[PDB]
Design a binder for this molecule. Structure first.
Ligand SMILES: OC[C@H]1O[C@@H](O)[C@H](O)[C@@H](O)[C@@H]1O
Ligand SMILES: OC[C@H]1O[C@@H](O)[C@H](O)[C@@H](O)[C@@H]1O
Ligand code: NA
Lengths: 346, 339
């Protein structure tokens, strides 16, 4: 079933329920996921109205871009030309600059395919917006099916050579309560290397480091506390995790990550080369989610994209987008029950 | 009463009915007026869904900007520097450039004051959008009251020196049907001068002309057919009217224009210096409004703003907006019925 209602400020809330009774919801404000529940428990973090997003934190569950992450000094090189983008975090351009796409009302259309329902959100990024050459016609399609798979499909075409590498900023918290840390979750992630940050400004250091056998190695499932409790310089630097992990094997076919709590698991599939993991290292900020004060480590993202820093570390990729060339990216989060035995205590 | 409903593509339709039973409706798609009716008659032109506006004509009833009208070569000088805006009509920048603010979904909030209801739409134009320095936080409040007054108040603030001169693009048609020319309406206009167009590109000619005692003098009410049957080269050039008229006296308290058809009349008030009048000179286009084929001259605008062409004729005014300055503009359309 599909249901729609106003969500505030002129935005809408589109709620879907599949045949298994799982419900998921999105808003056109930032083409974003608002909630995902199983048996009345929230699987992700979200608010109850549009205004909260705008007043508390506008990133959660959003489509962010045109370029996800931080670009050192807002400087990109496009077809031999230097361009300075909006700098909204000191001299850095973070998540596309200020008042970016995650803050806009996108138009949308719903397509009912029976076992699958699609919500295609559209938006045009005008030429020059936040310094990006364009115009860029973008669309983000969120779909949910009878097999509990939530899929995000991005498409984009630009009138001019530009840069594009958006991502989805959902935060998971299988506790279903923001006030409960995710250190009790089990994590498996198919990555042998990571990208360290230079310092507190969070730009990339310039090197790629092997994490095998460190507290950041999750090739084999381990509890998140292992990382949170780590005194590794990088962990101490950000007070948790806030890094790109380079996937060892690429392809939409491989389960790249799996997050488990008790009998529930979320599997991550993507055609992108890296996953940026940020564990809500907000300290005592205490943003209220459904009236619960969020705790430090009260959430985790799996933002799949081309790793940030490719400006300095070309080995990471090329996010350029040629005029007329069709960009496409696909990320899938699938929900499972009793996938494995995970019975722990913290 | 206030009613909100889904207008298509995720946009909303907000309809306000006042104590007199008159109904006006807006959509956040473009902070625009969609309909205005009395005794089941439409007074303005509009479509029945969001898609129609995107497919047929995105201007009708919309908030257009940041700069309304045509800018020669898309060029403006800001702080002595030349800036090139998005060119969407040849080398000209018409109504803000392609995919401008009229095609965006704006956020909004409704405020019910009893005798009056206000709908405040807001949108942020990012720095560099379509070549315009910013960011510009903009808001347009459309309100409707029990006295049948529809008012539009604009406000804006920019982080950088820029240009700003928006307008409301409603088209009136007291016939209540697009297939009927407005040539039968009577128009009164408190303007003794107009801005001639250079040619078919519609950029300004460079001069200001006195229209006293010509087919375009509407200082005393007259039927539009007059102007329509004129042999003035300017009328002939565009096949109707498509020009900025310079108001004789500035100020919100003066009725600047008045459009009349039978017992029904619309009065225009504004704090702007000019009114741009365009008589839907679409020839055979035949755009469909409520299943009715539009006819050449099947509508007329009263776009209040600073006259286009100030880039070449500085006397027209100055559209700059300095960083930190708050821009404000107000335009009111008042509906009257003779008893
Ligand atoms: O929401 C704020 C957070 O956004 C994340 O996407 C970034 O990686 C964090 O460093 C930042 O503090
Ligand atoms: O909507 C299209 C029309 O917009 C008006 O504001 C212009 O003056 C006309 O020349 C143009 O054809
Ligand atoms: Na709505």
């Amino acid at each position: 079933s599909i249901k729609i209602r106003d969500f505030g400020l002129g935005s809408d809330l589109i709620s879907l329920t599949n045949k298994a009774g799982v419900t998921i919801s999105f808003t056109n404000l930032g083409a974003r996921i608002v909630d995902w529940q199983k048996d009345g428990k929230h699987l992700i973090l979200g608010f109850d109205s549009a205004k909260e997003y705008l007043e508390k934190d506008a990133y959660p569950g959003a489509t962010v871009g045109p370029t996800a992450g931080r670009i050192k000094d807002g400087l990109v090189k496009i077809s031999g030309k230097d361009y300075i983008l909006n700098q909204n975090e000191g001299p850095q351009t973070l998540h596309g600059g200020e008042e970016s796409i995650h803050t806009k009302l996108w138009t949308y259309e719903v397509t009912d395919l029976g076992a699958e329902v699609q919500v295609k959100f559209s938006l045009v990024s005008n030429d020059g917006t936040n310094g990006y050459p364009g115009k860029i016609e973008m669309s983000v399609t969120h779909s949910f099916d009878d097999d509990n798979k939530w899929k995000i499909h991005y498409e984009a075409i630009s009138d001019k050579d530009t840069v594009f590498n958006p991502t989805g900023h959902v935060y998971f918290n299988l506790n279903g309560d923001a006030s409960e840390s995710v250190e009790n979750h089990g994590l498996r992630l198919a990555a042998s290397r990571f990208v360290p940050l230079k310092d507190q400004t969070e730009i990339v250091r310039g090197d790629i480091v092997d994490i095998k056998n460190t507290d950041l190695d999750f090739r084999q499932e381990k509890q998140l506390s292992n990382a949170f409790n780590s005194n590794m310089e990088q962990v101490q630097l950000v007070k948790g995790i806030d890094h790109p992990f380079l996937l060892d094997q690429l392809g939409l076919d491989k389960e790249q990550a799996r997050l488990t709590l008790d009998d529930t698991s979320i599997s991550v599939f993507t055609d992108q080369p890296s996953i940026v993991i940020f564990t809500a290292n907000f300290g005592d900020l205490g943003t209220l989610y459904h009236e619960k004060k969020q705790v430090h480590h009260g959430g985790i993202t799996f933002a799949c994209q081309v790793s940030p820093g490719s400006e300095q570390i070309p080995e990471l990729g090329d996010i350029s987008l040629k005029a007329g060339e069709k960009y496409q990216a696909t990320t899938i989060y699938s929900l499972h029950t009793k996938l494995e035995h995970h019975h722990h205590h913290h």
